[PDB]
Design a protein around this ligand. Structure first.
Ligand SMILES: Cc1cc2nc3c(=O)[nH]c(=O)nc-3n(C[C@H](O)[C@H](O)[C@H](O)COP(=O)(O)OP(=O)(O)OC[C@H]3O[C@@H](n4cnc5c(N)ncnc54)[C@H](O)[C@@H]3O)c2cc1C
Ligand SMILES: Cc1cc2nc3c(=O)[nH]c(=O)nc-3n(C[C@H](O)[C@H](O)[C@H](O)COP(=O)(O)OP(=O)(O)OC[C@H]3O[C@@H](n4cnc5c(N)ncnc54)[C@H](O)[C@@H]3O)c2cc1C
Ligand code: SF4
Ligand code: SF4
Ligand code: SF4
Ligand code: SF4
Ligand code: SF4
Ligand code: SF4
Ligand code: SF4
Ligand code: SF4
Ligand code: SF4
Ligand code: SF4
Ligand code: SF4
Ligand code: SF4
Ligand SMILES: [Fe+3]
Lengths: 652, 653
């Protein structure tokens, strides 16, 4: 049959129509070959727009639909379901992006943006003519979930999934689950003991019948697609027998290597054999082989002889149907802002070091003391927006929690020492959620905490005393302040965690300008990714507090449970296939695929290539490299792209 | 069996031990009858502390545990599981609070704090002796959910549940789903149209095979408990057979009367025969009798014959296992702030009115106009924190979104009219989520929007020209500014929706100080309530933007799916029951229970009261009111409370 195309140009209210002359684009679209219907409407995705398309598909017997509107990364599934409801195969639909790619980037050149939209419509119509009916591929969904990261956000997702009756694997890289919440002393705005409320969750997840917890483990390989993932988990060697070891810790004394205790942000030293923190789950000790000198003194003191250096990492192969990434975040390193003196002055600390100093289980026994002389500081200055809202360090975002945690620990210091003077140097106080503004008022009226509106310009150490002078304009007075402090705390912001690069490559997910992981859309799908069957939860998706991470944890559990409950999803048939009559068995294509889908086989008494449809993801590399042209990926054939290139310059 | 009690005093580092002499409390506890083991430990809720209790339960054969530490509101579930692991029934454990209620409030009176802790331990032991082993009551869960409110939050909850395979009811008060997002033009920080994100969801929800949508309907009664709710829905009468209705809109043209259109916040005027907004779902029309005149004019032009004045509201009865409240919010009414002149000055408008003005599908065709001149204002002032962060109006909270939506609509005005000068009067710019700070930088750098740090003191109308003058200090200059504007927009804050009182009364849930609905825990249960089987989602739980409301909708669906997926839950047995041999059916209790649990029955010829265990929530009002003592609430018996009162003054020996 000859193509009968319907072209629909959206205004997106004014987001498109304000820049692109949408009526003039629809008029141009009618002059194109095979276009029988062309309309422009304010919202194509709204109910009147979808009913319009479907009514045209039936009344005009359309076999192709072109929508010139937003990105297909937003609404391609939406319109594929729309046209499929009217009978039209979902892959006779072509998307033209005239918003993100045109109207929003050419606002000052309306005439050229309109001409450009016409070209983009024509390139779409060109490819549309050669599109073919494809069948969505139904695949079974493995009734198991994987959660990477055992913080409050990942714990919440596993408990929710486990409580629904889904088998769930929880992989935690460090020896213990708990995340940074396990490092906090208290939590604003209620000042609940952080570990005391979280520990019952850590207990629950270790004891849960439907949750397998792999602590001191990391995901090292992910293969397959939604509902059909095959993952490798490396259970790293503690070099201690989980079964034969107490957790008493009488081998550290017999260790000559002192190692930066990362749980305490390096303020206190830990031994080569260690337990991260007392409330750790699982409560089993570990040996850091990186700093281990293998002198064996611990093994002589060890009674059970649980110590075995021969211990090897064990790889777990497991099939899951959905994956939730919840690997958290790290604290910004404020060394780059040299005028503040971190790493140079003894008495400049980050706020997350402060959390460990204030915490009773912390290295200092909960006592805030200067790192130069060990005395208690009587004057303390907080500096806000350190590493955030700062183009000089590349972090132009707001870290969301630093305003609240700076007032929090100012309250906790006042409670342990009422006569401490505390000044907070801020730009905006962002106390934006339920009880936050009240917490902000409380900090000033009840705890007498001072607020200076003025980002400090530099910190100057008195080399005699070790004290610090903070210099800032009191912008609410128009005068330059130069107050002296005994301790300066840098309210450092949040950055992605160190391993976010490794995880990103394994899962195949993107990143937003803030370097955190990219949701499919901030409002349509706040915890989905554009990778089907992969979801986000918590601070790894962006800076946020505990209730926000927990909500995302539960949200990601709901979203990840949909394919598991359905038991069956559909994947795109944009796969490569070999034409046996043209393939001469050259061998070029088999090494090109990273999943080994193309293979050399003998057919009809001769050698041809053949691709296992199940191993092909649809990248299209091997068809592009095929010398004979026997390889082709559907929906992206060379002839279809050829017509699209012609469509820019001329109709066909 | 004679009580064998273990008493555990906790130091909580020095939180308790610094003020209360715990070793002294411990020694005193061993003087009380039935105390077999007593010890102080630094962290009782820590694993070594729990292992110390469970291990004593077995070695010393204890049948009661007292822990003097923090509040039961924190660790009561913690220690109940601890003792259950050791074979001891969880209701033979009693919590004494010596931190929140003693050491932390008597820091300067240590001697008296120690003596107080001793009385609090003795009162705990005293009740502990008479505690009884109880069993959790298992109940089935109806495999269906109910969502109340069809904004982004409620829609998201229904689609997630429906997609999981659970039958779901979605009740929407207005003729159309969509909520306040439907009223917005664009949405920060992507500046999509609201229709971009919402309308496909509205479409999906209406045709979902597992979602029954009851638009123009309201819940009017809810009875029962988790997994066993019996709800009554009043499906209001549209006076148009929806099955026959086409939504073409031919009828609206003929209508001879006009009506203030609430969807446009009293700006645009509609017919009594109407559909809220052009993209409304269901795409059906509604007749409002408050103004209908019944001349048949609408029916004459309608082909289908859907119009029908004989319609009567229908009441639907449905079993559900879980309920999600997502009834949204209302804009603050800034009339009470007299200094700004809303309701007095023509050209003072709220921000939600501005959204209806700027929206392409709006009564003004997307044209920002002065409501006095009809002209386009070339100078516009935004005033932040209207009705928020203000003790004079009883709203001491931050409404979360007003900073961003003010910068949003400023960008959109600048796009439609670059010549417009826009000044935002603010205290703090709260651009706190992903891309927000960048949105904030973009508003100033790219769109040349101006920010004045200074909360305006008053708005002075020019009666002659309708122009407005805004008096405020430029706090960043130390000078008083008096600039003139063609239009002033009040960035009003969020407040609970008018019908929130009705919904609260029906579902029996609490409210936070800000008057929004109270979550079960402010940190770890953001979408649960203290009422089992009832959950929250969206702005009715507190001021928040669309991404947060959508994430809560998906979070509430996960939480509300746990009982549905389990098909069974447990209810606490701290319930009331009748001793048939003591009750002579006086009838005092029946009317005391707001859930109708106690009932008069006839067994063995006589009348006797009887409590339906499933209907009892454990308040204990009617046992306190029973004159014969036949009625007792397990775990709070009169005799148990009597012992506790004596324990304040003497050992129960
Ligand atoms: C100084 C400071 C004070 C704060 N105060 C508060 C407060 O008072 N109240 C509040 O609500 N919020 C506060 N926050 C924010 C709070 O810490 C976060 O909201 C919270 O930690 C988010 O939990 P999460 O699980 O999403 O991330 P995380 O807590 O960081 O947990 C992520 C987990 O994943 C693990 N992980 C990381 N990489 C991998 C990998 N490759 N494989 C497997 N596992 C991995 C990590 O070990 C960690 O256990 C504060 C933050 C800071 C910096
Ligand atoms: C001027 C303004 C601009 C804004 N701009 C933005 C923006 O740009 N970006 C952004 O993300 N957010 C913005 N917001 C916030 C946004 O409006 C909310 O986050 C969002 O509307 C919350 O959705 P919701 O479903 O929770 O509540 P709602 O949107 O209010 O929906 C509640 C629904 O429940 C229904 N309902 C109410 N009572 C009952 C009852 N008794 N029975 C049954 N149903 C009932 C209502 O009819 C309504 O459909 C803005 C808010 C305002 C005021
Ligand atoms: S979304 Fe894509 S489609 Fe729905 S409106 Fe904005 S643009 Fe037109
Ligand atoms: S010492 Fe031997 S035993 Fe005591 S802990 Fe270290 S390992 Fe387990
Ligand atoms: S061996 Fe490696 S670890 Fe065991 S002690 Fe000597 S050092 Fe510390
Ligand atoms: S939060 Fe308060 S501090 Fe942390 S960034 Fe946004 S503003 Fe600067
Ligand atoms: S390359 Fe083209 S031709 Fe050479 S084998 Fe793979 S397919 Fe057959
Ligand atoms: S296409 Fe990309 S993926 Fe499908 S096979 Fe050839 S290579 Fe492996
Ligand atoms: S128990 Fe309540 S009090 Fe005793 S420690 Fe754990 S928390 Fe601090
Ligand atoms: S006319 Fe009869 S049908 Fe056409 S809309 Fe008004 S009502 Fe629905
Ligand atoms: S009848 Fe009621 S509704 Fe139908 S037209 Fe006359 S008025 Fe408008
Ligand atoms: S949001 Fe910006 S505006 Fe709305 S209140 Fe909190 S601060 Fe005042
Ligand atoms: S009140 Fe006490 S006594 Fe009178 S009936 Fe209800 S129960 Fe039997
Ligand atoms: S206790 Fe409160 S609830 Fe349980 S019955 Fe007596 S009254 Fe009704
Ligand atoms: Fe505790």
């Amino acid at each position: 049959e000859e193509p009968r195309i319907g072209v629909y140009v959206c205004h997106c209210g004014v987001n498109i129509g304000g820049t692109v002359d949408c009526p003039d684009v629809t008029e141009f679209a009618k002059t194109l070959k095979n276009v029988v219907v062309a309309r422009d409407y304010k919202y194509m995705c709204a109910d009147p727009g979808q009913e319009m398309i479907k009514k045209d598909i039936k009344e005009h017997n359309l076999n192709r639909v072109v929508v010139a509107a937003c990105s297909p990364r937003l609404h391609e599934p939406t319109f594929r379901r729309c046209v499929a409801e009217a009978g039209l195969n979902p892959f006779l639909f072509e998307f033209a992006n005239i918003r993100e790619h045109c109207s929003w980037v050419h606002m000052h050149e309306k005439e050229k943006a309109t001409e450009k939209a016409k070209d983009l419509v024509r390139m779409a119509v060109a490819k549309a003519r050669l599109l073919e009916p494809l069948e969505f591929i139904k695949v079974g969904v493995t009734q198991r979930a994987l959660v990477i990261g055992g913080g409050v956000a990942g714990i919440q997702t596993a408990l929710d999934l486990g409580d629904m009756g889904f088998e769930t694997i929880l992989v935690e890289k460090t020896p213990s689950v708990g995340g940074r919440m396990a490092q906090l002393d208290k939590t604003f705005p209620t000042n609940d003991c952080s570990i005391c409320i979280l520990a019952p969750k850590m207990v629950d997840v270790a004891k849960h019948p439907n949750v397998k917890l792999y602590a001191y483990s990391e995901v090292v390989d992910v293969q397959g697609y939604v509902g059909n993932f095959k993952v490798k988990i490396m259970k790293k060697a503690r070099y201690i027998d989980e079964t034969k070891c107490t957790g008493c810790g009488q081998c550290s004394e017999v260790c000559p290597i002192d190692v930066p205790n990362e749980f305490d942000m390096g303020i206190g030293m830990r031994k080569a054999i260690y337990k991260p923190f007392p409330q750790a789950v699982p409560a089993k000790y570990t040996i850091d082989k990186e700093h281990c000198i293998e002198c064996g003194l611990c093994a002589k003191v060890c009674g059970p002889n649980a110590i075995d250096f021969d211990q090897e990492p064990e790889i777990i192969e497991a099939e899951v149907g959905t994956i939730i990434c919840a690997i958290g975040y790290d604290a910004f390193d404020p060394t780059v802002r040299e005028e503040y003196g971190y790493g140079v002055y003894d008495n400049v600390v980050t706020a997350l070091e402060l959390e460990r100093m204030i915490n009773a289980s912390g290295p200092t026994g909960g006592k805030v003391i200067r790192l130069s002389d060990g005395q208690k500081p009587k004057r303390i200055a907080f500096i806000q927006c350190v590493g955030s809202r700062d183009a000089k360090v590349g972090n132009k975002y707001c870290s969301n929690v630093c305003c609240m945690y700076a007032m929090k620990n100012s309250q906790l210091i006042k409670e342990k020492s009422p006569d401490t003077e505390i000044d907070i140097y801020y730009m905006d106080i962002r106390a934006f959620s339920k009880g936050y503004e009240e917490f902000y008022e409380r900090s000033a009226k009840q705890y007498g905490i001072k607020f200076m509106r003025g980002r400090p310009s530099q910190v100057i150490e008195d080399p005699e005393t070790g004290n610090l002078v903070v210099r800032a304009e009191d912008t609410l007075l128009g005068e330059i302040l130069e107050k002296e402090y005994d301790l300066v705390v840098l309210s450092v912001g949040m950055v992605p965690t160190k391993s976010a690069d490794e995880v990103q490559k394994i899962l195949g997910i993107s990143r937003t300008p803030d370097q955190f992981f990219m949701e499919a859309h901030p409002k349509l799908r706040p915890v989905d990714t554009a990778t089907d069957g992969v979801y986000l939860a918590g601070a790894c998706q962006g800076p946020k507090d505990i209730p926000a991470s927990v909500a995302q944890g539960s949200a990601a559990a709901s979203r990840a449970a949909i394919p598991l409950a359905k038991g069956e999803v559909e994947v795109e048939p944009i796969i490569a296939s070999v034409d046996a009559e043209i393939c001469g068995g050259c061998g070029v294509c088999v090494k090109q695929c990273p999943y080994g889908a193309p293979r050399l086989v003998e057919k009809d008494g001769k050698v041809v290539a053949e691709v296992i449809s199940a191993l092909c993801k649809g990248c299209g590399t091997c068809p592009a490299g095929c010398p004979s042209g026997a390889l082709e990926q559907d929906h992206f054939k060379t002839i279809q792209l050829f017509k699209q290139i012609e469509g820019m310059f001329r109709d066909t």
